[PDB]
Symmetry: C3
Subunit: 462 residues, 3 copies
């Protein structure tokens, strides 16, 4: 049975970076070399300030940077020496041509497959670590077979990531499961056991699932679709709660206490964000349309349509409450990241709520404690930003003479604000639109102050 001793990982993003640091930290006898085409990333890993901030990552990196964990821009030498080659390059959504906005672009994987087969001889294991479309490993095998050399035996496996932005180290040291997919051939099983033996240094065998290559690629996309479907389902219930008088937090709790359903991912919101949910669902839909499966495509498309409906419905309540005219009205936008405790604004619901209010000619005063000022201006552009957008340094400056306060990100600080002071300098009637259910428990207090507070999944009183 083959044993893996030297590992190369193409791509030093949030995928291959943290994953390989844990491998070097739990397998001291294995030499792990993380490479990337960006020289600025390599210098950032070798600097006392890492490019990505994960809790407990500094302790893991500095414990191995020098012994068995190395970062370099010399990709050819790392590929030649390694027994296992990770492909951790980003596969962005296509923005052009057939499949624009849904299909994934494989140009960064095509380059690695052609560069791996170039600077390699003998037996090596090629494993796709990034989120790839289904049957993409067939494309990698096709490049290897067409460009075959004497004494070249490249094995192609699938081992997708499942870590979340915030608990990467905890999810890598104690993962729910490790997914490995390979061909159902004696050569493929040897490569699977080789990679499977690497994780057995700190992962039990029960939490290691071995499937075929296609089941591994499909599981990564479907897992994010199942998670996204839970949010859209509870969001669809929130719209029904607002029309029946029910409360979505009460309904989500009653649903969540069923052990077969679970209580995770049942928090209604203005809409899910991030660079993974909509990206993978839209790719899953494109896959079904390409495979003549229109019933399956329109099934999963409802997850996106529901999420778009949730955002547009929330913005319409704000405009309808403001007498269907928001021209030259000051609106405070509290929160711009797609979730709390981060500065990432990729596919954030605050972008769409802002643009919906910008289409009414509103004067938005946006505040977010961690999102940089330049990111807000870029996400709200294609001229229009300079006329309507103002970025406040604190919440109270954004609510100085504002008609309404809109909460789009569940930052904990918004719960502890002095709403007595805010109401004094707000125009009347003063509105609060809680798009994250963070003020649950302050409704009676905020109404006695003078606020008309509306929130997702609760019928408005009077």
């Amino acid at each position: 049975m083959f044993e893996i001793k030297k590992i190369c990982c193409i791509g030093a993003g949030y995928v291959g970076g943290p994953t390989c640091s844990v491998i070097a930290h739990m397998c001291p006898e294995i030499r792990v070399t993380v490479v990337d085409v960006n020289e600025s990333r390599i210098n950032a890993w070798n600097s006392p300030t890492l490019p990505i901030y994960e809790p407990g990552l500094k302790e893991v990196v500095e414990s191995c940077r020098g012994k068995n964990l190395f970062f370099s821009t010399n990709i050819d030498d790392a590929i030649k020496e390694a027994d296992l080659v990770f492909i951790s390059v980003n596969t962005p959504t296509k923005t052009y041509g057939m499949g624009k906005g849904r299909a994934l672009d494989l140009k960064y994987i095509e380059a690695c497959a052609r560069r791996i087969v170039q600077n390699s001889n003998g037996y090596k294991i090629v494993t796709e670590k990034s989120t790839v479309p289904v049957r993409a490993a067939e494309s990698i095998r096709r490049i290897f077979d067409a460009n075959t050399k004497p004494n070249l035996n490249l094995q192609v496996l699938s081992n997708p990531e499942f870590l979340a932005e915030g608990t990467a180290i905890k999810d890598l040291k104690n993962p729910d499961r490790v997914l490995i997919g390979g061909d159902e051939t004696p050569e493929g099983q040897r490569a699977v056991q080789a990679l499977c033996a690497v994780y057995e240094h700190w992962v039990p065998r029960e939490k290691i699932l071995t499937t075929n290559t296609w089941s591994s690629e499909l599981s990564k996309l479907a897992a994010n679709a199942f998670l996204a479907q839970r949010i859209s389902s509870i969001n669809s219930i929130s719209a029904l709660c607002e029309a029946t008088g029910a409360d979505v937090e009460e309904v989500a709790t009653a649903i969540g206490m069923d052990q077969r359903i679970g209580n995770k991912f049942l928090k209604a919101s203005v809409g899910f964000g991030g660079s993974c949910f909509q990206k993978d669902v839209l790719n899953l839909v494109y896959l079904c349309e390409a495979l003549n499966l229109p019933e399956v495509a329109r099934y999963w498309q409802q997850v996106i349509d529901m999420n778009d409906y949730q955002r547009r419905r929330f913005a319409s309540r704000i405009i309808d409450s403001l007498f269907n005219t928001v021209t030259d009205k000051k609106i405070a936008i509290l929160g711009f990241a797609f979730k709390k405790d981060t500065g990432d604004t990729r596919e954030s619901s605050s972008i769409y709520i802002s643009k919906y209010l910008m289409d009414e000619g509103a004067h938005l005063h946006i505040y977010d404690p961690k999102v940089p000022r330049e990111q807000i201006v870029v996400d709200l552009s294609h001229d229009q930003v300079s006329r309507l957008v103002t970025i406040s340094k604190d919440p109270y400056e954004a609510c100085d003479g504002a008609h309404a306060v809109v909460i789009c990100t569940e930052w904990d600080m918004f719960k502890e604000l002095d709403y007595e002071r805010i109401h004094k300098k707000m125009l009347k009637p003063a509105f609060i639109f809680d798009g994250r259910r963070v003020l649950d428990g302050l409704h009676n207090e905020l109404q006695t102050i003078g606020f008309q507070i509306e929130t997702i999944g609760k019928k408005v009183s009077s």
Copy 2:
């Protein structure tokens, strides 16, 4: 009970201007103060040259300008007045949710917030302009949120019904006076107070008291019923051209029914003005917002038929010209949306022109009252310079033209010398009567050599 002695009207623009002059003319004991944020308008009212030209308006203004009629101090006028009129224009939104249909309440938002600021005690607030339904709820919401001790503001609805041309006559002898207020003992007091103002010259039978919502809805529905009659008879005109019937004969037979009436049955190329399409499209948007799609698509047919009437007329011209109008000279006679005016807002001549401009035609436009600069603005978004020429007289527009198009029912177009026109027109020469003004000259024009076609008559 309560008596109104001092009146303020925010907005001096065709609506509140003439209405308050008549109130001051029939109520010498009531002080009427018209205010506006634009100083140029106020100085125009106090000058011997008024900003708007209505017949008999100078006689009413000069009789009261100084005694009880006054025209820029909005804060003091609100504090002293018992009744406050809101006569600000509410334009159609050109952006956001409801673009092209919904109305923008930003000019009413300012008045409601400025009233509640410079006001104490008991005052009556009455909306005079064309507002969307439930707009008074928005004014009440601002008053309730910004309430002061010993502040009792009453909100009423009193829409206008005057037309551009007979404003003074429609105010002295109105068909009806609409006043809407809440069905509460406090609201009824304010309604009777406003009713008592019109009783100085309007009989009580012609003063109707309804709720606030019925008054807002009646103003929109009244213009839709009028527009529906024109679109209905226009749909018949298209049917007459296919059966051989005549639309003027059918409209007469329909009009002699006492239950139907004979008013607003004149078939045309399409109705114009800033009130018909604006109020119908706003009515359709209201129904969609209230989950009433059946009602929305019902009233949308008034607009679709009017758009069909214009596009159908333009297609007849192109098909008669062998489906090619590139570099062809066409005389466009009439540009206003109706006769005896210079207003070209939503005029059917604009759409017929643009339909012919999309074929690369050389249009020579003439209108006796529409200014030359107004035609160039209405035909823009380049394209106007290459194709549009404005003639000072009809004959200059018909010098080497293939066809003559009549889009406005000007009386002078009936008396033109068509014998001279045909001699310098390219052959074959066409005449397209889009207003049924040549009824009676069909046999004469055909003997001259013209092929005359008109709305609601088989060729």
Copy 3:
């Protein structure tokens, strides 16, 4: 009755047709006129268009009875027969944009003919005109009538770009349409006697004016319908395992169907097929015949489906990513042995691949270098398009080779050399069925070859 001795032709289609008339009618004076001075001077020089055997025909009569002039007024006044051979382009604006024909060049001729003419003359429309257009010409003549002024006929062309002289000397049929009046029959027999100098009487068909205008449009629609029909079968062969060339041969051996115009391809091109079919569809919509309109629209929809389907196969074989990939496009004209690229299927296959961010290396032995850049524009052309001076240069480091025109030279290329400098895997997409017979050889070399109407 009347005999035609002097011929005027507005528009230098009309060039080759009148040169043959002057070559077979030495006693008839043929004068070709045009408003463009550049064309007329080109005809009198040692020609603007290249047709086989045309130089021999022109030089045999240029001076005796064949003349080219820019003086249109004098030729109309003197001629007994006046041909209207002006182009009627598709409208790009207004009512009927993209489908209807523009009659401005016919309107101008009708008003200029009726101006510089007196007495009896025969007016014949030679170009492809819409139906009932002759009714419009009669209306202009009746409106601008002079004393002692008296005929409108239809005589459409049927020559193809490449065999004009052979199709004019030995035509399949001569179509002449005129009114069902004693005056119209005189004008028809007058025009009939001109073709009887070298065309038998059996191959001369006399119909009414409207049947003659519709026959020209319908004939191109029936021809286009046969290509779309065999193309729809080609898509079905790729899914069943059948072969379209075998099915087309088995169908073609039926005497009632015929074997002509049954070669499946990436899509038909030219300035006549789609132009006349789209105009035929617009005519039906204008006459409240939507069932007939959507019937003939399927010929266009199938042709667009054939092009888009072929372009999609190329991208899917290339792993659904063609960004910064070198692709060789062999052939740009709509057919072989020509340089015309009007409505060529190579334009759409290229633009489909350009929308994926591909680096196209185009080669065509006869299409000019500047024409390819124009057909691919409205900055995008400069970044993605490269024009190769010879083959192999387009396949130097290319991922796939696409054949869009049935040039005979593409069959005789050295594919062994091409594969050595191509990136692997190397693909060949035969969009014209020119490599039928080399499939086993190309696969042993290392190529994965795919073609229209054959299952992979």
